[PDB]
Ligand binder design. Structure first.
Ligand SMILES: O=P(O)(O)O[C@H]1O[C@H](CO)[C@@H](O)[C@H](O)[C@H]1O
Ligand SMILES: O=P(O)(O)O[C@H]1O[C@H](CO)[C@@H](O)[C@H](O)[C@H]1O
Ligand SMILES: O=P(O)(O)O[C@H]1O[C@H](CO)[C@@H](O)[C@H](O)[C@H]1O
Ligand SMILES: O=P(O)(O)O[C@H]1O[C@H](CO)[C@@H](O)[C@H](O)[C@H]1O
Ligand SMILES: *Cc1c(COP(=O)(O)O)cnc(C)c1O
Ligand SMILES: *Cc1c(COP(=O)(O)O)cnc(C)c1O
Lengths: 833, 833
C-alpha cells in the first residue's frame, strides 16, 4: 500500500498543468470555493480536468476516420455495463500517477474521490459487461467502431437487503450529472411508431405514425495509450413540440404537456432480467427505438462517404457491406434486419433481392444463451399494432427463407415448421433468433462448447442449410480494467519481471511460467493477494460493518442469482461444512469466508428465496460459538462493476458451479483467473477452455459433463435417489424442512426444498457428492501455501487467451473483415484547423 | 447602424482574453471544431465565456453577505419573466463592446448569435416581468436579495397562428441547455404532501406525508456595473429513490419507476392564465412546493447567522424579522404565512402568539389586481386533503383575526362575514388575499389609483381595522434592458448630451427638457426612431415575410389578450379607418401600421375569438387596392420579452386602452414612454401618474374616468343606446353580424357581437366616440414631424419616476427596512481563500 507502480509518469510540467486546471474547474465549472467544496465537488473538478485531456484526441480520432474513411463497425446492444469512468480514462491516457501527485499536492486522496463516482449501471450482467470490454478493446485495436445503445435514466436497480430480503430501488445515477457525456441535440432524429401501411402505386408507405425523437449523447471510449478515442452513442427519447400538444379538439393543454413523459418513457429504465424474456410493449419499443435511430446515423455517414462526392450513377448501396458492419449483440437489436430492409426497399427503392444481399452481408449475430426461457418470441399481435410494415417484411423474409429450405430439404415437412420465423400456437409469435440467423452472414456462440451446442442441438436445422454461417468467438475480459485498474500490485510485480507490453498483448503472461519455482515471485504473488484480502476485509468492516478473518480462504461466488448458476449447490456445501464441525468441534478445518453476491431480477421469486436462504445460513453460522472464526458466510449486497473490481482481486477460490451445458461462456471466471484465484468448476462454458489452457491439474473440475447430464435426462432425473443415498444431504433437507434455519418462521423454505425434491431443472443433488469431495481437495492445497501459489502462477500465466483484444481481433478478422492495428494515432492537438 | 455607442470599452488585453476563452469553450466545452461549428455552437462558446466573467463576483457577493450578514430579502414569486440573458449580462458587466470586437475579430456577428438564445419564458405577462425587473434593480441597489421560484420545464407556450387561429405548443426552452444556471443537487430539500395530523402530547405532528424533493438551480443576477451578482433560486421537483419504488406488495417494479414522473410533474409546466384563477390541484402543489423549500433555505441561513455562533439562550427567533423579509408577489406564495407558523409552532415550538408577531413582521404582500375572477379562493376540501395542518393553522388565524374585528366593530355582524378568510357557500373556500392582509405587515398596490381603490372598495374593511398596513409603490421598468439594451441609439444620443449617470439614476432624464427646442436633438430623436422602425420593418419581412411601409405611424398594442385590456375597441377603430377611406378613397389620411400582439390563455374562448377577428380584419384590409399602403393591420405572433425588446423601440403610438378602473398598473406603458412613443390612453393604472409626470398636454387621454364608469353602472350600461346613436358604430356591428369579415363563414363572429351588445363587462361602446375623436388628434400631430418629436422629448424626459430602481428603493425603505446602496463591491477576484 505504499503505492507508486507504473501508473505512468508524474512529471513536473504536467502535475503543474493539472493542479492548475483542477483549481480552474472548481471555480469556473463548479462555482465552488476552497472553503465550501466537498469531496464530491473535488471528484468533479478532477473528472472535468481528465475529460479535458481526452477531447483533443476524440476530435482528432473522429476527423481522422472521416478523412481516411474506413469500414465502420456498429455494435448494437441494449446494454453497456460501463462501471465508473475516471480511473480507467487515466489508465488509458497515462495520467494515473501525474493526477495522484497533483491531488496529493492539493492535499486530497485520489482514491477517496474515485469512490465518489457512481457506476454507469446500464446493464444486468455478462452480456452488458461483454459490450463494455469490447468497447475498450475495439479502440485499443484502432477500429472505427461505435457502440450504440439506450441512455437509460435509471440503470439496474440498487439492491438493498431488509431482514435478509432484497429490496430494490431506483438507480438515480445521473442525480449529480455526468462529466463524461456530450449531449448532442443538434443531431436528434425521429423514430416512428404505430400507423398504417398504404399500398400506393409503386410502394408501401408507412403512414399515420406517432413520432418520438431520439436525442443522442456521446461518451468517449479511449483506447489504451494509443490516442484513439471512439464514441459510445446512447439515445434518449424526447416527445415532439407539436403533437405533444398540437391537434385541435379539447382534452386539456396542461395535460397534453404532462403526457409528453409517456414518449419520454422509452429511455427511462433498464429492463431488469439476466436470462429471461419479458414480452412487454415498452421493451419492444426500446428495441425499435435504438435500431431506428442508429440506422439513420449509419446511412447518413455512408452517404457522406465518397458517394457524397460521386453518387456513382446514383448512390450505389453495393459498397454498403464494404463500408458498414453491424454486430447484433443477442436478438435485442434484431429489428435492425427488417428495418434495414424497410429503409432500402421502401425509402431507397432497391429491389428486395438487392437489399437482401446487402442486409445479409452487413449484419452478424452473437447468441448468448441456449436456455429457452431467455429467448425472444414477440407475439405477432403486438408487432402488427406497433410496427405494421416490419411484420410484412418479416412474413416476406420468412417466405423466401422456407422456399430455400423446401428446395433443399424437399418433402421435409417438419423441417419447415421448425425453421419458420413465425411460430404457430394460440399466440402466434415471431422467433427473433430465427430472424437473425436468416438475415445475418455469421452467427456465433461465446465459448467453444456453446458454439458446438448451437450447431448440434439448438440451430441444427440452420447449420444443415448454411453451415458456413456458424462460428465461435470465445469471450474475453479487458486486462486494463480487470488487471491494471483493479489490481495495481499484481500488475506491478508482473511488470517488473516481464515488462509492460502485456497490457495490450496478454499472451506474454505465459513468459511468467518461468517464475513458477522462483521464490521471489512466489512470495510477491502471495503478498499481493494478502494485501488485497486485507484491503477488502477493511472495506467490509468500514462500508458495511461486518468483520471477517483475512487469514481464511476467501471463497466467492459473485454473478446474477439464477437457478442454473447454482448458488443453492454452494449453500448445500456451506451447511455441510457447518455440520461436519458441529459434530466434531475440535477438529481443525481450514477456515473460509464464503461470500455470495448478485442481484435477483425483482419478480423472480426463486432467486429472491435463494437470497433469503443465504442470509439465513449466515444468521445461524456467523453466531455459532462452537464455529468461531473458522466459518463465516457473507452475502454481498449490491453487486456490480465497482464491487467486482474490489472483491475479485481478493478472492482465493472462485465458484463456477453451473450445470454443465447451461452457462454459454461466463466472464467472471476469466476475471478471477487473472487475479490469482483458483477455480472450482464444472466443465461448462469457457471453464473448459480455461482448464485446457492451464491444464486440468491446475484447475478444480468436478461434476457431470454434458454427456452425463443427457444420460440422466433420458434416464429421468430423480432427486429422491440422492436423498436416499447421502445421509449428509438427507440431514440438510430436514434442517431446511424442519425450521433449523428459520426458527420462528419454520415452514419458510418449503418451496426451495420442494423444488429441489420434485422440480430441479438444474439437478443440484446430482453434483453434490462429487462437489463436496472436490471442496476437500481445495482446502488440502490451501493449507500448503507455496503449492497454492504455484497453481495460482499457473493460472495467471495462462490468462492470455481470455483477453477481449484476442476476441475482437477474431471478430475483426473473421466476421467484420477489418485488420486490427496498435499504431498510436498522432493525437493530442493544441490546434484548430 | 454603424454602431459603436457606449457599450463600454473594447480594450486590447480583454479582447485578447475573450477570443482566447471563446476558442477554449468551443473546443473543450462544446467539443466542436472550427469546421463543424454552427451559429448555435458559437452562441454557446460566447455564453460560456461571459458566464466566466461573472462567477468571480457571484462567489464574492455570496461570501460577502455571509461575512457582513445583512437583512435578506426573499422575493417569492411563482413567475420570473427573464427573457434572454447574454446581452443584459454584458451590459451589466461592461462587456458589450469588448465582446463585439472579439467576435468581429473571430469573424462572427454578435447580433446573429444573440438571436440564437431562447427566452426564459417563465412568466405570463406583467406580474412575472415585474419580478424580473425587480431582480435587476435589487442587485443594482446592492440589496442582499434572492428571487425564489419554480424552475418550469416548459415555460409559457409558444403561440402559433393557423388560419388566423392560435395554436399553442410546448416551450421546450431547455432543449439545448442553459449556460446560465448552476444545478445544486447537494442542497436538495424535501417537501411534504397529504398526511394526517396527530395531536400527541404537546403538539400536532403532521405524519404520513408523501415526500417530493426540491432540487435547486441558481442563476446569477448581476447588478449594473457594481460587481454585485445575486441569486435567482429556482426549485425543480424530484421523486425520492425509496418510495418511488420501495414499499412491499406487488404492483410493478418498472411501473414504480415510470410513476416517478408524477412527483416530478410539479415543476413541469407554467400555469398559462394572465388574470384568471385556476382552482386545479397541481397549481396548489406548485404553490406549496415553492413556499416549503424556500422557507427551509431561509431558516437555514438565519440559523447559520450569529445564532450559529451564540444561540442566545437558545436560537431566539426574535431577530428573525430583523434578519428576514419575504415579499409575497400576489397571493400565489400566500401559504408562506401558515407554513412559517407551522415550522415555528410545530417544529421550533414557540408560542402561537410569539410566532404570529414574528410572521407578521417578516411578511408583506403586493396585490396585482382588483378583478374578482383573478382572485384565489382555494376550496377547503382540497387544502384538507393535501395540506391538512395548514388548514388548521388557517382556521386558527381566522379565529383570532375576527376576534379582533368583533372587539373593534362590536355588534357588526356583516363585517365579520365579509372579513373571514373562510368563505361559506356550497363549496366552502379560503380567501387567500384575506390571509395575506391578516398575516402581512404591509399590503400594497402597484399604482396610486389602484392603491386608492383597494382602500376604498376592495379591502375597505381591512383598511378600517389596520389603516397603517396599506401602502402603494407604483411599478417600474429597468432602464438597462428597457432602454440601453433594446435601444442602444436612443441611449447614445441621450448619453452624448447629459452623460451616462442616468442608467442608474433615470431622474436625470429631466435634464433633457432643456433640449426640447434644440434642432440637433430634435433630428437625432427623429432619426433613431426611423432607424428602429426600418430595422423592425426588415425583421418583419425576413423572419415573418409580411412587408409594411416604414413611413407610416406605427400604432401598437402588445400585451396579453384579455377583454378588460380592450383589443376590441382598437379593432373597432381600425374598421372605422378602413371605412372612412372606402367611402372617400382619394382623401388623404395619415398612413398607419396597426400592430396588435399578445397571447390568449388556451381555453379563454373570447380572447381566442378576438385573435381570429384581428387576423380577419387584416385579411380584408391588407388586400384592399383602394386602401393601398395607407392602412395595414398586423397581428404579432408569439409575443414575449425578446419581441417586446424589438417592437417597443419602433413604436410611434402606444395603445393603453383599458376601461378605467381595470388595469392595476401596467408596465408596457412605461417601456414605451422611455422609447419615444406617445401614449393614447384612458386614465387607468399608472397612465394617470405618467400623464401627471409629463403633463396632460403631452399625453393622449380620452374616455371615461372611474367616476364615470360607476355613474354608468348605477345607471345601467346599455350598449344598444350607443348602437342607436352612432351610425359608424352601427355600420361596424352589421359588417361583423352579416359576414363582411368572414365571407364563407358568415355567422363566425356572432358571439363577440352578442357580447358587445348584451354582455359587455368592460363597456367598449362607451369610450368609442371619444376614442375615435382622440385618434383624429394623434394623426394631426403626426403629420407635423417637429412637433411630434417635441411631445416625444417631453415624455422621454419625464420617464424618471418609472424606473424600478425608485420602486425598489421605496420597498426597501418603507417596507423591508433596508437602505439601498450603489457602492461597487470590490469584485472580481483571481484568488482563492
Ligand atoms: O456523427 P458524426 O458527424 O460522425 O460525429 C459528430 O461529432 C464529432 C466529434 O465532435 C464531429 O467530429 C463530427 O463532425 C460530428 O458531426
Ligand atoms: O447476462 P449474463 O447471463 O451474465 O451473460 C450472458 O452473456 C454472457 C456474455 O456472452 C455469457 O458469458 C453468459 O454465459 C450468458 O449467460
Ligand atoms: O445557499 P447558500 O449557502 O447561502 O449559497 C450556496 O452557493 C454560494 C455560491 O457558490 C456559496 O458561496 C455558499 O457557501 C453555498 O453554500
Ligand atoms: O400579468 P399582467 O396582467 O400583465 O400584470 C398584472 O401585474 C402587473 C404588475 O404589477 C400590473 O402592471 C398589471 O396591471 C396587472 O394586471
Ligand atoms: C463480469 C461481470 C458479470 C458476469 O459474471 P458471470 O460470472 O460470467 O455470470 C456480471 N456482473 C458483473 C458486475 C461483472 O463484472
Ligand atoms: C412588460 C411586459 C408585459 C406587461 O405589459 P402590459 O401592457 O403592462 O399588460 C407583458 N408582456 C411582456 C412580454 C412584457 O415585456
Amino acid at each position: 500500500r505504499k503505492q507508486i507502480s507504473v501508473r505512468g509518469l508524474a512529471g513536473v510540467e504536467n502535475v503543474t498543468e493539472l493542479k492548475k486546471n483542477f483549481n480552474r474547474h472548481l471555480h469556473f465549472t463548479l462555482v465552488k470555493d476552497r472553503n465550501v467544496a466537498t469531496p464530491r465537488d473535488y471528484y468533479f473538478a478532477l473528472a472535468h480536468t481528465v475529460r479535458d485531456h481526452l477531447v483533443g484526441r476524440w476530435i482528432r480520432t473522429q476527423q481522422h476516420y472521416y478523412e481516411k474513411d474506413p469500414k465502420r463497425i456498429y455494435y448494437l446492444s441494449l446494454e453497456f455495463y460501463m462501471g465508473r469512468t475516471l480511473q480507467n480514462t487515466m489508465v488509458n491516457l497515462a495520467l494515473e500517477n501525474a493526477c495522484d501527485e497533483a491531488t496529493y499536492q492539493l492535499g486530497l486522496d485520489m482514491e477517496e474521490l474515485e469512490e465518489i463516482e457512481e457506476d454507469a449501471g446500464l446493464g444486468n450482467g455478462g452480456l452488458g459487461r461483454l459490450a463494455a470490454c469490447f468497447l475498450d478493446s475495439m479502440a485499443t485495436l484502432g477500429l472505427a467502431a461505435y457502440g450504440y445503445g439506450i441512455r437509460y435514466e435509471f440503470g439496474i436497480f440498487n439492491q438493498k437487503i431488509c431482514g435478509g430480503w432484497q429490496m430494490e430501488e431506483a438507480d438515480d445515477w445521473l442525480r449529480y450529472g455526468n462529466p463524461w457525456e456530450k449531449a448532442r441535440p443538434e443531431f436528434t432524429l425521429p423514430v416512428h411508431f404505430y400507423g398504417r401501411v398504404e399500398h400506393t402505386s409503386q410502394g408501401a408507405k408507412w403512414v399515420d405514425t406517432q413520432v418520438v425523437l431520439a436525442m443522442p449523447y456521446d461518451t468517449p471510449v479511449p483506447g489504451y495509450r494509443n490516442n484513439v478515442v471512439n464514441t459510445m452513442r446512447l439515445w434518449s427519447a424526447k416527445a415532439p413540440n407539436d403533437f405533444n400538444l398540437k391537434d385541435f379538439n379539447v382534452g386539456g393543454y396542461i395535460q397534453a404537456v404532462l403526457d409528453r413523459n409517456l414518449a419520454e418513457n422509452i429511455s427511462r429504465v433498464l429492463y431488469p432480467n439476466d436470462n429471461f424474456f419479458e414480452g412487454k410493449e415498452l421493451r419492444l419499443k426500446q428495441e425499435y427505438f435504438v435500431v431506428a435511430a442508429t440506422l439513420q446515423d449509419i446511412i447518413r455517414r455512408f452517404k457522406s462517404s465518397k458517394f457524397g462526392c460521386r453518387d456513382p450513377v446514383r448512390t450505389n448501396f453495393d459498397a454498403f457491406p464494404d463500408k458498414v458492419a453491424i454486430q447484433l449483440n443477442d436478438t435485442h437489436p434484431s429489428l435492425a434486419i427488417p428495418e434495414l430492409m424497410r429503409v432500402l426497399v421502401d425509402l431507397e427503392r432497391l429491389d428486395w433481392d438487392k437489399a437482401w444481399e446487402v442486409t445479409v452481408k452487413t449484419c452478424a449475430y452473437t447468441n448468448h444463451t441456449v436456455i429457452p426461457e431467455a429467448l425472444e418470441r414477440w407475439p405477432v399481435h403486438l408487432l402488427e399494432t406497433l410496427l405494421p410494415r416490419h411484420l410484412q417484411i418479416i412474413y416476406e423474409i420468412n417466405q423466401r427463407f422456407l422456399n430455400r429450405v423446401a428446395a433443399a430439404f424437399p418433402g421435409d415437412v417438419d423441417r419447415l415448421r421448425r425453421m419458420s420465423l413465425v411460430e404457430e400456437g394460440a399466440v402466434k409469435r415471431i422467433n427473433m433468433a430465427h430472424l437473425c440467423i436468416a438475415g445475418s452472414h455469421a452467427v456465433n456462440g461465446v465459448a467453444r462448447i456453446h458454439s458446438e451446442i448451437l450447431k448440434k442441438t439448438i440451430f441444427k436445422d440452420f447449420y444443415e442449410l448454411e453451415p458456413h454461417k456458424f462460428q465461435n468467438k470465445t469471450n474475453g475480459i479487458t486486462p486494463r480494467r480487470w488487471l491494471v485498474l483493479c489490481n495495481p500490485g499484481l500488475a506491478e510485480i508482473i511488470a517488473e519481471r516481464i515488462g509492460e507490453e502485456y497490457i495490450s498483448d496478454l499472451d506474454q503472461l505465459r513468459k511468467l511460467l518461468s517464475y513458477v519455482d522462483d521464490e521471489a515471485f512466489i512470495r510477491d504473488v502471495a503478498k499481493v493477494k494478502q494485501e488485497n484480502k486485507l484491503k477488502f476485509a477493511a472495506y467490509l468492516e468500514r462500508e458495511y460493518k461486518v468483520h471477517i478473518n483475512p487469514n481464511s480462504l476467501f471463497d466467492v461466488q459473485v454473478k446474477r442469482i439464477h437457478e442454473y448458476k447454482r448458488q443453492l449447490l454452494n449453500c448445500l456445501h456451506v451447511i455441510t461444512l457447518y455440520n461436519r464441525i458441529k459434530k466434531e468441534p475440535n477438529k481443525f478445518v481450514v477456515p473460509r469466508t464464503v461470500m455470495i453476491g448478485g442481484k435477483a431480477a425483482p419478480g423472480y421469486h426463486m432467486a429472491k428465496m435463494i437470497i433469503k436462504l443465504i442470509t439465513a445460513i449466515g444468521d445461524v453460522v456467523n453466531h455459532d460459538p462452537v464455529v468461531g472464526d473458522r466459518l463465516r458466510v457473507i452475502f454481498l449486497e449490491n453487486y456490480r462493476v465497482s464491487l467486482a473490481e474490489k472483491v475479485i482481486p481478493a478472492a482465493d477460490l472462485s465458484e463456477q458451479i453451473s450445470t454443465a451445458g447451461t452457462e454459454a461462456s461466463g466472464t467472471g471466471n476469466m476475471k478471477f483467473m487473472l487475479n490469482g484465484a483458483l477455480t472450482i468448476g464444472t466443465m461448462d462454458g469457457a471453464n473448459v477452455e480455461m482448464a485446457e489452457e492451464a491444464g486440468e491439474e491446475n484447475f478444480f473440475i468436478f461434476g457431470m459433463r454434458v454427456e452425463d447430464v443427457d444420460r440422466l435426462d433420458q434416464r429421468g432425473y430423480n432427486a429422491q435417489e440422492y436423498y436416499d443415498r447421502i445421509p449428509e444431504l438427507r440431514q440438510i433437507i430436514e434442517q431446511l424442512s424442519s425450521g433449523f434455519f428459520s426458527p420462528k418462521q419454520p415452514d419458510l423454505f418449503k418451496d426451495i426444498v420442494n423444488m429441489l425434491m420434485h422440480h430441479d431443472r438444474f439437478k443440484v443433488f446430482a453434483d453434490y457428492e462429487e462437489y463436496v469431495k472436490c471442496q476437500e481437495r481445495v482446502s488440502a492445497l490451501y493449507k500448503n501455501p507455496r503449492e497454492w501459489t504455484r497453481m495460482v502462477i499457473r493460472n495467471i500465466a495462462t490468462s492470455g487467451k481470455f483477453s477481449s483484444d484476442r476476441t475482437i481481433a477474431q471478430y475483426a478478422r473473421e466476421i467484420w473483415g477489418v485488420e486490427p492495428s496498435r499504431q498510436r494515432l498522432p493525437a493530442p492537438d493544441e490546434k484548430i484547423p
